[PDB]
Amino acid sequence: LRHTFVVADATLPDCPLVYASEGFYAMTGYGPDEVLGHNCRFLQGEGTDPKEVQKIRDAIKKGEACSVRLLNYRKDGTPFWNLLTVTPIKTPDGRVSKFVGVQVDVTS
Numbered sequence: 001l002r003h004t005f006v007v008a009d010a011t012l013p014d015c016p017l018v019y020a021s022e023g024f025y026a027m028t029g030y031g032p033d034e035v036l037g038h039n040c041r042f043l044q045g046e047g048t049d050p051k052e053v054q055k056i057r058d059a060i061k062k063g064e065a066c067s068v069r070l071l072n073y074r075k076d077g078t079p080f081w082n083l084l085t086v087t088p089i090k091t092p093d094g095r096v097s098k099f100v101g102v103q104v105d106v107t108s
């Protein structure tokens, strides 16, 4: 399964991405300069299902893992279907420190 992987910093209030695999930058068209420090939601656009988006929003607030199918757009504006799975990573005191995300392009 060809997949990409990113880390978001839950200690900052809008979960900015702090690490992305080589595949994430090659799949999306975006450089580190335009990804690090930003919330993953820039990948979204006109056809992205707000119902699915909201499922991720809620799981992140409730600190649960979650898995959704989103329509994302590359930097050149072409779309692709992104099967996204976000996992919360907690410290020993139960608090959420990072969210890790695996993304798979499932356009087949």
Ligand SMILES: *[C@@]12=NC3=[C]C([C])=C([C])[C]=C3N([C][C]([O])[C]([O])[C]([O])[C]OP([O])([O])=O)C1=NC(=O)[N]C2=O
Pocket: 006, 007, 008, 015, 039, 040, 041, 042, 043, 044, 053, 054, 056, 057, 060, 070, 072, 082, 084, 086, 087, 099, 100, 101, 103
């Ligand atoms: C994105 N991947 C991704 C990876 C991680 C680890 C996290 C925490 C989130 C994402 N998102 C979603 C985005 O950050 C945000 O959570 C959602 O837009 C919903 O919340 P908001 O506040 O915006 O309503 C990813 N979103 C994508 O579209 N593509 C991914 O690869």
